Amino acid sequence: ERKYLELKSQKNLYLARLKSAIAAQKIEEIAGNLDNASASSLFERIETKILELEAERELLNPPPSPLDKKFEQWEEQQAVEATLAAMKARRS
Amino acid sequence: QEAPEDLLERLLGEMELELIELRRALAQTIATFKSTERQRDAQQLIAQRWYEKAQAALDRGNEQLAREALGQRQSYQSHTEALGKSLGEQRALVEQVRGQLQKLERKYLELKSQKNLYLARLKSAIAAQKIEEIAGNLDNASASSLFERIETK
Amino acid sequence: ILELEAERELLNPPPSPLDKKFEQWEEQQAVEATLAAMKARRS
Amino acid sequence: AALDRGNEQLAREALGQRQSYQSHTEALGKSLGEQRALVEQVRGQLQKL
Amino acid sequence: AALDRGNEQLAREALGQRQSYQSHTEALGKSLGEQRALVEQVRGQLQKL
Numbered sequence: 001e002r003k004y005l006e007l008k009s010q011k012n013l014y015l016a017r018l019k020s021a022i023a024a025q026k027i028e029e030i031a032g033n034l035d036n037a038s039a040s041s042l043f044e045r046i047e048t049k050i051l052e053l054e055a056e057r058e059l060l061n062p063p064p065s066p067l068d069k070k071f072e073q074w075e076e077q078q079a080v081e082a083t084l085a086a087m088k089a090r091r092s
Numbered sequence: 093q094e095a096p097e098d099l100l101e102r103l104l105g106e107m108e109l110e111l112i113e114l115r116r117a118l119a120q121t122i123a124t125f126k127s128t129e130r131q132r133d134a135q136q137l138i139a140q141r142w143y144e145k146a147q148a149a150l151d152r153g154n155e156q157l158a159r160e161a162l163g164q165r166q167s168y169q170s171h172t173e174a175l176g177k178s179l180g181e182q183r184a185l186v187e188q189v190r191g192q193l194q195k196l197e198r199k200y201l202e203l204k205s206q207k208n209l210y211l212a213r214l215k216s217a218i219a220a221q222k223i224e225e226i227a228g229n230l231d232n233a234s235a236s237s238l239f240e241r242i243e244t245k
Numbered sequence: 246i247l248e249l250e251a252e253r254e255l256l257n258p259p260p261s262p263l264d265k266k267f268e269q270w271e272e273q274q275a276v277e278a279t280l281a282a283m284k285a286r287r288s
Numbered sequence: 289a290a291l292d293r294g295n296e297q298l299a300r301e302a303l304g305q306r307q308s309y310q311s312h313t314e315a316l317g318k319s320l321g322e323q324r325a326l327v328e329q330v331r332g333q334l335q336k337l
Numbered sequence: 338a339a340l341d342r343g344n345e346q347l348a349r350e351a352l353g354q355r356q357s358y359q360s361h362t363e364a365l366g367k368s369l370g371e372q373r374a375l376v377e378q379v380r381g382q383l384q385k386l
Contacts, residue, residue, distance in 0.1 A: 012124050013182060019117040020189055023110045027196060030103060036206060042096055046210075050217045057224045115252065122251035209372060216379055223386060263350065270347075271338060276304055283303070284291065 097214055104204055111197075118189070125182060132175050139168040 034042040142165040149158035230238040290299035339348035 009124070009128065013121070013185075016117060016121040016124070017185070020114065020121075023114040023117065024192070026110050027107075030107065033103065034100070036203065046096055046214060050213060053217050053221050057220060060224045060228055115255070119252035119255070120248055123247035126251075127247055209375075213375070220382070267347065272307055274342065276300075276307065280299065280303060283299075284296065287291065 097211065100207055100211070104200075104207070107200065114193070118186075118193075121186065125179060125186075128175070129179065132172070132179070135168050135175070136172055139165045139172065142168070 038044040146158040146161035234240040
């Protein structure tokens with residue numbers, strides 16, 4: 001009995017270990033299913049999907065070259081400067 | 093095939109079952125060693141009685157009685173030394189797993205948050221997709237067939 | 246009981262013994278400082 | 289009233305006991321302040337509403 | 338409050354413990370900034386839409 005009671009105790013300790021290991025196994029597999037590192041297919045798949053969908057939207061309305069962006073600003077710079085130059089000079 | 097975003101929420105919901113399973117499974121662990129800890133306490137206390145018997149033996153010059161009482165305690169002491177070391181061995185098991193667990197929720201809660209951010213991104217992208225297709229259906233530029241079709245009409 | 250006892254403790258992870266002595270120690274400083282000022286106030 | 293007549297020891301427990309109430313006081317005092325903004329902000333919202 | 342009265346040792350653990358929270362703070366602080374552009378860019382898109 002002295003041996004059996006000890007043996008009966010160890011399994012309960014060890015039964016926990018397999019339960020802990022059992023729980024310690026499912027955590028990693030699910031992490032690899034979708035990973036923040038994007039190595040997992042799902043995270044990159046959907047993220048790339050956004051990029052796949054993102055690119056097509058831009059082309060349908062071909063964005064004007066950066067020239068007008070600076071020019072529309074520049075002419076705005078000339079416009080705002082000319083307006084404020086006249087306005088500030090109007091009430092300098 | 094099922095939409096990946098539909099599964100997303102389901103996968104996290106399944107995790108807590110293991111977490112609570114570990115919660116109860118881990119709790120079952122704690123009751124083991126402390127129960128043995130109490131069992132050890134009785135044995136050492138019982139051994140102390142044989143020491144209380146051993147110390148009371150030589151009192152009045154009866155040294156012989158202490159020999160058996162102390163000798164008997166050795167069997168309990170033999171259990172004590174064997175049992176004392178055994179308790180120490182498994183403490184690292186609870187220690188290491190506890191450090192693992194605390195980090196595990198720390199990671200999971202963060203992961204659970206990112207999907208909500210990212211679930212928005214697909215929703216924003218989902219909404220950001222239907223806007224362009226309808227625009228090409230009929231366009232003020234007349235490149236779309238309908239606008240020019242009816243206008244030419 | 247031990248099986249049920251252990252799970253209760255974890256749900257509210259008890260603060261490390263550091264605050265127990267520190268909350269006492271700062272209380273010791275607080276009580277000593279208060280009584281030091283109070284006893285000195287009406288020494 | 290403890291140290292009065294030289295009984296300093298009694299004050300130790302009375303003051304020590306007050307710390308528990310003071311512990312509640314500090315915890316409760318801050319809690320009251322936190323929710324005052326809640327009534328303050330909503331009142332400003334309502335009057336405008 | 339640790340070094341107060343010359344107990345420098347206690348501050349070591351308290352400050353050391355804060356580093357773990359600070360480690361979260363630095364990691365969490367940067368994360369908040371990253372997603373602000375997401376709401377910023379989409380808002381500009383929407384208003385035009």
